[PDB]
Design a protein around this ligand. Structure first.
Ligand SMILES: [Zn+2]
Ligand SMILES: [Zn+2]
Lengths: 45, 393, 130, 62, 265, 55, 123, 153, 113
């Protein structure tokens, strides 16, 4: 907390509850702190 | 980003919770109805209003100064149908030729002498559609084999404000240069032309309401033998690749000045698959009769093009990122499902299949290709806006 | 209130270039060997095959009233009567002329040279056939 | 989430037909729709697609 | 007997196939929709829930009952709450119903059969939970568990399909004409052969085939229409046709009546 | 943020086109018209109508 | 008594990370490896099933192998915005905003994968 | 309740909102009686390219009639040529298309239509949660300009 | 929220006649009849039976816009013959056609088992 906002916001959110397939999706999610990375690499298969 | 992104409209209070705008005034704001929202502002002084109606009225805006041509034409249904209604084959009988004249508000109250009297007294779209065109409107065209008796019924000729010959579509009623609109604006004025839309509309939309129109998988299937004739235009195209690959894996080819021996290898593979794909589709294009709905929606000029048909009935195409066919992210291979050093097309991302029919590999590459697409549509989106902003300030 | 043309031709051929209900036919005249004829037509209302003996007419005469004229004039002593307008007046070399007639969507061409005082340049025009 | 009285599409009643159907399955081991008198797919889809949640809801206490 | 004519084909209690000839399509169609939308019926309209422990919400059940089919035989000898001089409602224009459901049988079901008719029917066929179910409890309103209760009170009223779908007694109606496209009111889609690829209709047997040698008949008009009038109950399949034929008429009437009221002045 | 552009007698909702509206019209939901006003000075040409609109 | 733990304790299936992947050869269709179907073109492993390269989202999309990929990517998002049933206990939940479609309906067409997405019971 | 503006969509990026709402009479129909619940435009197909959409319909029009669950699952052994044959066994055109009579006049439609049951998700985002209009409302403090957001007027 | 009350599709509102007839200036002997709270069901039916009185020179009808249940009918007849009448007649011919129908459908029915 403190005078340390030099952290990362996003970790831990408000679980979706619009639909079932919504919630599943939300849990199986990944992030990535910030033209090449956004690509769908081969390794992604 | 337009002088036209904001226009003054006549207010019409209506029920139901939504701003109801005309179709032809669609492309200026560039909206669609998939959820899009619109802002509305209300003048407040007696002049404020005037300033809004004398310079920002939608009718004054019809001819865009940026490209010295109109910027609002007839879209979708109205366009698509206006085409049908025009063909020599399109005939309408009294009962309807009447309910059609009624829908034109300016109608002089005079039914035009039937284009046919002999057995049954009929009329043709070309005739009635014309009751919408004001007197003094002279339009001349000429497409391909077009000559004062347009065989394929090409070109367009309207004299005294009556369609003489040719079919009417995007070319004759679009936000184009020769545009019957561009002309009616110039010849009659903001007002007259602005009304012209609604009419050409009202008649056509109504007509279509009754003639109906649709599309279904059936519009995307190719002739029994054509689907074969293509397959083997990919097989042969496959070997014209295996061939130049053998002839490369032997050093039996010279380096086209300025290019690497390798680069020059691609340069051909690419130019081989492309020309293959190009006719693959072209076989089906001419294989879709003058009844294929998808074709119809393409000629009218109201949606999609050759390319589209192709990727749906023939071959999807070659996938690509950064300009080169699917890379080797995995040391010397496309996917782990491949043998190393496979430079072939089935590995580098060539989807030989049609949407009507992709194989995992094809399906994947294809994704990697589209993925690049989505990328800039999500980047060039605001950097373009900056460059815009600068020019302004 | 007079006639402006009368002549029997012979169908040289019938063309249906992608038209399920209309055919553009052509045929030469039986009198002069200068008069040709090009005409679009409703194959559905009035069928026609190659080699037919048709009599073509024109002229202006007998809002648009429905029937009721059962007890009225009937300059319809034929089996096909279209109304339309003619647009261009072309000269094909020599002193041979050829007027172009469009019937609210149906094109037509005539050729020869002897209606130098018969075929006018007006919109009026009724085609007749039997 | 219970059975839908009358089919959206055409209108024919269909409330009663639930138990008849869910029965001609368990026992008569069966087409069911066809005999239940559900002709055109509009009403057909009605029954053949219902997922009776009410059952699970009912499994709750007070 | 006279003008247009009927020729009923196999007819039952929940259907009425028949051929309507010697009429203009225009007029057939008109009657078509009239059945679909403007025949007076009787449906629950107001629901006064008192207690409800069901897993379904108030207005969810409320909806349900709006759809439950009620009797509507002598529906014509009742008045629209809007014309009746009674503040709100009464026997002379409405049918009140009761519904009590206590969970006792340790899954208890609520069928439309469980409705009482608390108001005075005045001795006229109406306000009855149309049951066609095999056992005798048509339309499962809803289920409930252990001690869940549920007390309602319904009020039914006249009304039509325009006002709401919960009214129209029609519910699907077949309509076809000239199975052999002779009138050419259609352009068949096809890949090679229209005729082989496009299903021939069971209706093609009461009209003569095409016959190649014949040119295209033009002066011919849309005569004869093969239909089928399904019913949901409330009104007998036969009436759902008669009454239709008649309401359309009553309307055509006032158009002539309203006319008269405008000549005096 | 506040000077070269500010939030401003304005409304916004969802669009859907209508094929029976003159090119230049724009159907506004009753709701909205009953919310947005317009200061019209009283004048012996519109007094009559205004005194009605007011009642 | 024959789980997935046994399918692994018998060397019939392996857990391949992205790195190890590099040095193996994977066969698509276990079996194989008509003028209608899509034209199909050392092995160490085979693919449980290609339709497993998809995640929750696409798994509900019918014939995702027949649409323009960029579209599938969209539906991949709108799904997280449709209505249905997010739980059954919902009637005992005090959460701000929640929507239940009056009458659900499992689709007339489905993915074999839906079976694990309890989709048929929560359309 | 669904209203003339609320948004919907299938499972193919085929999103769209309501423009109007007609009833059974006004609606176009097929001899059987069957009438559409939804009428989307043929124009949302050509450039969207989403064809599977077209397929789910066909397949689902069979699964409708057959009672058997229709598999749409990814890379399997099911084809458009196959389903079409299954649909011909039941009675309707092998491609879906059906004859329809214009709900206003009863006269047949010169054309045929791709009439068939398709799944549609009712995305959240209904008009009445967005419709907003203001004329001199709560003014901000520091600035004195209006205030932000439709929720705070 | 902004949608009318259903009952506005058939009930005339505060002082409103089913019919309002206006003379047409565009051409001689012509009229435009505004029908309130009505549709194709009744419109097209009236439109139709008028191209039957070969004494009627013109007859088309239309629905201005779908939100509002109204419709305009334009009629024009021969010399010294008032269209309003032709509207009556063609309107009466309609009821008879249906009167017959009702009947022919009732005797027909009874003969069913
Ligand atoms: Zn149904
Ligand atoms: Zn009362």
């Amino acid at each position: 907390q403190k005078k340390a906002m030099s952290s990362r916001a996003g970790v831990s959110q408000v679980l979706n509850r619009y639909t079932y397939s919504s919630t599943l999706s939300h849990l199986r999610r990944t992030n990535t702190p910030i033209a090449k990375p956004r690509q769908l690499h081969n390794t992604h298969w | 980003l337009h002088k036209m992104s904001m226009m003054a409209h006549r207010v019409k209070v209506m029920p139901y919770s939504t701003f109801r705008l005309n179709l032809s005034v669609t492309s200026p704001y560039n909206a669609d109805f998939d959820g899009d929202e619109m802002n509305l502002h209300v003048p407040q002084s007696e002049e404020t209003r005037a300033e809004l109606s004398q310079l920002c009225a939608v009718p004054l805006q019809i001819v865009s100064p940026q490209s010295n041509k109109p910027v609002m034409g007839i879209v979708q249904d109205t366009l698509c149908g206006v085409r049908k209604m025009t063909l020599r084959d399109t005939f309408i009988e009294y009962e309807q030729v009447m309910n059609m004249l009624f829908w034109v508000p300016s109608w002089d109250g005079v039914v035009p002498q039937p284009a046919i009297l002999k057995p049954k007294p009929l009329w043709t779209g070309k005739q009635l559609l014309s009751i919408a065109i004001p007197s003094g409107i002279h339009l001349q065209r000429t497409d391909g084999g077009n000559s004062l008796l347009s065989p394929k019924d090409n070109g367009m000729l309207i004299v005294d404000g009556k369609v003489m010959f040719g079919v009417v579509d995007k070319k004759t009623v679009g936000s184009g240069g020769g545009g019957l609109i561009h002309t009616v604006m110039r010849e009659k004025g903001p007002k007259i032309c602005a009304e012209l839309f609604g009419n050409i509309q009202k008649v056509v939309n109504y007509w279509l309401l009754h003639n109906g129109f649709s599309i279904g998988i059936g519009d995307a299937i190719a002739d029994a033998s054509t689907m074969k004739e293509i397959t083997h235009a990919i097989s042969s195209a496959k070997e014209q690749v295996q061939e130049i690959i053998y002839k490369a894996q032997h050093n039996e080819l010279e380096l086209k000045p300025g290019m690497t021996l390798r680069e020059s290898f691609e340069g051909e593979v690419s130019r081989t698959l492309n020309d293959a794909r190009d006719s693959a589709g072209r076989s089906a294009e001419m294989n879709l009769k003058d009844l294929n709905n998808v074709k119809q929606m393409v000629s009218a000029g109201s949606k999609g093009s050759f390319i589209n048909i192709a990727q749906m009935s023939a071959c999807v195409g070659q996938q690509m990122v950064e300009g080169k066919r699917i890379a080797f992210g995995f040391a010397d291979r496309s996917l782990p499902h491949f043998t190393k050093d496979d430079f072939s097309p089935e590995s580098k991302g060539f989807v030989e299949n049609s949407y009507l029919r992709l194989t995992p590999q094809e399906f994947f590459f294809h994704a990697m290709a589209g993925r690049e697409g989505l990328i800039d549509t999500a980047v060039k989106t605001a950097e373009t806006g900056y460059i815009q902003r600068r020019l302004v300030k | 209130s007079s006639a402006l043309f009368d002549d029997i031709f012979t169908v040289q051929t019938v063309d249906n270039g992608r038209y399920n209900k209309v055919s553009r036919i052509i045929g030469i005249s039986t009198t002069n060997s200068a008069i040709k004829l090009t005409l679009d037509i409703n194959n559905e209302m009035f069928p026609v095959s190659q080699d037919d003996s048709l009599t073509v007419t024109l002229a202006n005469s007998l809002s648009w009233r429905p029937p009721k004229p059962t007890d009225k004039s009937l300059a319809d002593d034929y089996d096909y009567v279209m109304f339309g307008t003619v647009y261009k007046f072309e000269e094909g070399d020599e002193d041979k002329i050829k007027v172009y007639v469009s019937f609210g969507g149906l094109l037509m061409c005539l050729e020869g040279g002897y209606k130098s005082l018969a075929s006018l340049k007006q919109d009026n025009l009724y085609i007749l056939i039997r | 989430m219970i059975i839908p009285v009358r089919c959206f599409s055409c209108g024919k009643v269909v409330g009663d037909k639930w138990d008849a159907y869910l029965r001609l399955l368990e026992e008569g081991k069966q087409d069911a729709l066809d005999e239940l008198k559900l002709k055109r797919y509009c009403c057909r889809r009605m029954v053949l697609t219902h997922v009776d949640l009410i059952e699970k809801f009912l499994r709750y206490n007070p | 007997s006279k003008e247009p004519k009927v020729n009923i084909i196999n007819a039952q209690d929940d259907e009425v196939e028949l051929m309507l000839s010697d009429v203009n399509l225009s007029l057939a169609n008109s009657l078509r929709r009239t059945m679909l939308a403007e025949v007076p019926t009787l449906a629950i309209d107001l629901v006064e829930i008192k207690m409800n422990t069901s897993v379904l919400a108030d207005e969810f059940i409320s909806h349900r009952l709006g759809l439950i089919p009620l009797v509507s035989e002598d529906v014509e000898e009742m008045k629209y709450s809007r014309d009746c001089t009674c503040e709100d409602y009464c026997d002379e224009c409405s049918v009140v119903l009761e519904l009590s459901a206590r969970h006792e049988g340790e899954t208890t079901d609520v069928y439309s059969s469980s409705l009482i008719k608390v108001s005075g029917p005045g001795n006229l066929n109406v306000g009855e939970p149309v049951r066609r179910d095999d056992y005798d409890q048509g339309i499962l309103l809803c289920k409930l568990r252990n001690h869940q209760e549920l007390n309602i009170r319904c009020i039914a009223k006249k009304g039509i399909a325009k006002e709401h779908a919960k009214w129209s007694p029609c519910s699907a109606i077949a309509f076809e004409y000239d199975p052999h496209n002779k009138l050419k009111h259609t352009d068949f889609w096809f890949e090679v052969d229209a005729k082989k690829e496009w299903p021939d209709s069971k209706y093609a047997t009461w009209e003569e085939p095409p016959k190649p040698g014949e040119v295209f008949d033009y002066k011919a008009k849309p005569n004869r229409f093969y239909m089928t009038v399904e019913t949901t109950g409330s009104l007998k399949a036969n009436q759902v046709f008669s009454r239709g034929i008649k309401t359309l008429q009553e309307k055509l009437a006032n158009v002539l009546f309203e006319l008269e009221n405008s000549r005096p002045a | 943020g506040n000077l070269m552009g500010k939030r401003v007698f304005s409304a916004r909702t969802v669009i859907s086109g209508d094929p029976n509206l003159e090119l230049d019209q724009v159907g506004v939901p009753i709701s909205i018209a009953k919310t947005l006003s317009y200061p019209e000075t009283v004048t012996q040409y519109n007094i009559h109508r205004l005194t009605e609109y007011v009642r | 008594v024959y789980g997935w733990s046994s399918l692994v304790t018998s060397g019939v299936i392996e857990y391949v990370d992205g790195e190890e992947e590099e040095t193996i050869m994977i066969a698509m269709t276990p079996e194989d490896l008509d003028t209608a179907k899509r034209i199909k073109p050392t092995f160490t492993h085979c693919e449980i099933h290609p339709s497993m390269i998809l995640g929750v989202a696409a798994s509900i999309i019918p014939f995702p192998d027949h649409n323009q990929s960029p579209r599938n990517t969209y539906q991949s998002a709108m799904g997280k915005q449709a209505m249905g049933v997010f739980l059954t206990n919902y009637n005992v939940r005090m959460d701000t905003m929640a929507n239940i479609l009056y009458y659900p309906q499992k689709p007339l067409a489905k993915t074999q994968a839906m079976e694990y997405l309890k989709f048929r019971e929560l359309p | 309740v669904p209203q003339i503006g609320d948004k919907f969509a299938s499972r193919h990026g085929q999103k769209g909102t309501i423009g109007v709402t007609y009833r059974h009479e006004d609606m176009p129909f097929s001899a059987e009686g069957i009438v559409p619940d939804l009428i989307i435009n043929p124009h949302a197909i050509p450039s969207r390219m989403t064809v599977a959409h077209l397929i789910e319909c066909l397949l689902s029009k069979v699964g409708s009639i057959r009672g058997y669950e229709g598999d749409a699952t990814p890379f399997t052994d099911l084809t458009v040529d196959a389903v079409s044959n299954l649909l011909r066994d039941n009675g309707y055109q092998s491609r879906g298309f059906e004859v329809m009579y214009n709900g206003h006049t009863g006269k047949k439609l010169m054309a045929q239509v791709f009439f068939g049951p398709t799944y549609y998700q009712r995305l959240r985002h209904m008009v009445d949660d967005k419709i907003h209009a203001r004329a001199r409302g709560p003014v901000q403090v520091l600035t004195r300009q209006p205030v932000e957001g439709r929720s705070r007027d | 929220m902004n949608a009318p009350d259903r009952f506005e599709l058939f009930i005339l509102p505060d002082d409103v006649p089913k019919l309002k007839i206006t003379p047409d200036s565009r051409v001689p002997n012509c009229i435009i009849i505004k029908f309130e709270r009505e549709d194709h069901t009744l419109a097209n039916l009236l439109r139709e039976e008028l191209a039957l009185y070969p004494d009627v020179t013109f007859v088309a009808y239309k629905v201005e816009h779908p939100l509002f249940a109204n419709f305009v009918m334009r009629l024009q007849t021969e010399e010294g013959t008032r269209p309003k009448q032709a509207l009556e007649r063609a309107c009466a011919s309609i009821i008879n056609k249906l009167k017959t129908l009702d009947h022919k459908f009732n005797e027909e029915w009874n003969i069913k088992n």
